[PDB]
Symmetry: C3
Subunit: 340 residues, 3 copies
């Protein structure tokens, strides 16, 4: 909610309380998302300052607070900064910003990431360009310098983040995304290539010095109808873990298919029908294995713009044969959300 607007500067302090619970077979040990309490709260701000007639400065921060944790020693599990960036926009020239932000491949993967709780599994956090990453300088353009309306292109420069784990580590890289929108329809083509750290190559799973991520996207967003389709492939980028041998690393090749179909009713009901298939290739000692495979059936109910309730059910298509050890059981998520 916008809480400040005075002398050429506006502040929008936003947040949400999500009373979330997961339902699965067993103790959520071998399911799609686990079971039990998954309550979380959000807090952050969106800032914008009118510098002059056609130049604006901005700054955004977002944090994830967890409510499913105790007040004891485990009081800080899953607590992280999601967004933290500042930048400038100069009319019909472009926008530049530095700080923790979504990658440029998410410009294509954000098409199918509209499900009540789950969906968009390929948009991993701290994974080069598919999700929220550090060391990123993003240039974004709207309407091609104010010449061709709808045509939007973006370029990003990923910096090296040598961390304790190879899962969260990355090298230097450049990404891009081209998009055009015309009367409901929208087509996106994103690509991102980056170097891999020495710790990433040291892992038992995954072999290669270079990491590549690309995704395409077609959608229709007009008259209460949302239909989305994503197809993408990653090279030495998708984070994978073997539950049998207790080994971590990356998948050499993945085919990622996302399909989403939603309708928004006038009385405030959004049923959601989706499909997700993500299969890996050339896994060390394994070969070809399905990482993510399911059908999504859900429904979201908005009371207004502030209060909402949703039930998100996933029909897990992953077999018990899975050579890596991915959860095969179904996961039902019911959540009540207040937001401001």
């Amino acid at each position: 909610a916008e809480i400040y607007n005075k002398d050429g500067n506006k502040v929008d302090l936003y947040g949400k309380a999500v009373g979330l619970h997961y339902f699965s077979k067993g103790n959520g040990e071998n399911s799609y998302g686990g079971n039990g309490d998954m309550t979380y709260a959000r807090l952050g701000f969106k800032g914008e300052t009118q510098i002059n007639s056609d130049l604006t400065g901005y700054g955004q921060w977002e944090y994830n607070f967890q409510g499913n944790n105790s007040e004891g020693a485990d009081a800080q599990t899953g607590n992280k900064t999601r967004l933290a960036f500042a930048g400038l926009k100069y009319a019909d020239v472009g926008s530049f910003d530095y700080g923790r932000n979504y990658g440029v491949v998410y410009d294509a993967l954000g098409y199918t990431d509209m499900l009540p709780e789950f969906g968009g599994d390929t948009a991993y956090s701290d994974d080069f360009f598919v999700g929220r990453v550090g060391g990123v300088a993003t240039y974004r353009n709207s309407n091609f310098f104010g010449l061709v309306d709808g045509l939007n292109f973006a370029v990003q420069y990923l910096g090296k983040n040598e961390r304790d784990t190879a899962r969260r580590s990355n090298g230097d890289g450049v990404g891009g995304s081209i998009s055009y929108e015309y009367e409901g329809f929208g087509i996106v083509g994103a690509y991102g290539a980056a170097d891999r750290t020495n710790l990433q190559e040291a892992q038992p799973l995954g072999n290669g010095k270079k990491a590549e991520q690309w995704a395409t996207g077609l959608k229709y967003d007009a008259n209460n109808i949302y239909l989305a389709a994503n197809y993408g492939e990653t090279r030495n980028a998708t984070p994978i873990t073997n539950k049998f041998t207790n080994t971590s690393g990356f998948a050499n090749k993945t085919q990622d298919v996302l399909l989403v179909a939603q309708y928004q009713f006038d009385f405030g009901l959004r049923p959601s029908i989706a499909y997700t298939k993500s299969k890996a290739k050339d896994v060390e000692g394994i070969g070809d294995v399905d990482l993510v495979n399911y059908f999504e059936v859900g429904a979201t109910y908005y009371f207004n713009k502030n209060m909402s309730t949703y039930v998100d059910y996933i029909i897990n298509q992953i077999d018990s044969d899975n050579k890596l050890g991915v959860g095969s059981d179904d996961t039902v998520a019911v959540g009540i959300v207040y937001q401001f």
Copy 2:
């Protein structure tokens, strides 16, 4: 403080800075609350949205920030999310909410929890129903569906939270609290029963598959006078630690007595006289031992609704003989508080 109120939605961002210090014999090693710096700050929001004529949606989050910590490695000690929940209320039918919230036994124990700093020791955090817990769905009713004014009943459903420590672990359970208020007077009767996890049974202290918590409460809150009385008993629920054998677990039986007497002066002075007795029974290898035993003498001074200063002194009645090893020395707490 309420910072937003527009189109059927209001946001109340609240918080406080508590400049707190503890005084005790030694290095607070063997006292009621320890000694030294205990400065802490709070931050959170209270939200409410007017959905229609007689339906309201809400969402609340609360966090505890610690100021008595360094900026080094110990920069996150005692930092936790206290509240994180969202829910709906529909006029004279009831109110339902899910997310981290106080248990239903606190509806009775909150009667005597009005002391400047200490008091309400039996209202432990992450302990089934006596305090703030996870996995709770609470239904609350006011004026018995709008028929019998003053009569308030509530039901809660505690979910299983299998954690790293048995202290913070709990199973599935159901709780309840019945209350009636009439011209200053108020009588409460709360009860809560829940299952115990395998880690809780594995502890050297405490034996039993079921955990029970019940408490009664009588008070008078009229014309600047606050008199409160609590009596409760727990079954395999009260968290206890043996300082001699270095063992943790739960007490099989506890008798909990709370007495509070306060007056609010017109010039802004609230003296506080209280008594607390909590004795354990059937402790493994010990038997009967006093957990909490003291007299409280304190005073709170409100400058206004925002600024306050208080001195809270506890006369510890616990002997040095204590077979478990509970602190016997007195603890004096002086704190200066700003709140908004």
Copy 3:
């Protein structure tokens, strides 16, 4: 930004998003500040309540959120509470506050701490009186009880903070700072003495039961010109680490020299020219070694009061001979900042 002002109470919720990056030789292993991503975000509040005609209550909290971290296990590195205090001011008598706050020696060292990114190395955090510390009760006076305008004196009482590390540990102590300001000019003389904990004496580096910190300061702050000069000496107080023997402790004697020269242009440009020399003496097994030695050349550009960009370059004067093992390579920092 001030977001609340009603019935004798005002709340100022402030924060900033700093898109910061560091440039150095190698992997920032042997430089002045390191290299890579250093993005951070801030959040806090400034409160003030009008109690009566000439008495005001206040409360301030400040937190540092890090954006250069992952969402995984390292999601809470460098996250700390910087400020957390509440206090009272009574017209021309003085101001008293308790809670985490800057030390009284920073009243002199804050003179040269005006550089775009770096500078003020002698103002260490959790170090007795030079920076932000715990267990501090500060009395501050303005215009000498309203008699001699410009003359400001302050007294502080540091409490003992026995922590896990000797670096962040301190004992009981008293500090003071006397200052006078007259038409741009300002002269400050600060002093602070405190006891050392048993863990601080147990360290291989540093020998002495008492810790002393004093600093002087001359400045000119008038007509877009800022010229500052600091000189100070510490006794068993300055935290030092030997990179060769892997030992930590304190320096017995340090000579601290700070020089700053800045001009503020009318179109919004602030070039910064600074000098810093901090040499240690009587180091255990070493003797005399330079801790901090460099020239600062930088520039800050304010678009307005909310948006800013700066480039801060340090010319590291420290040799590779350094017997302790302090970074010798240069560090270039470029940052884009939004604030509200």
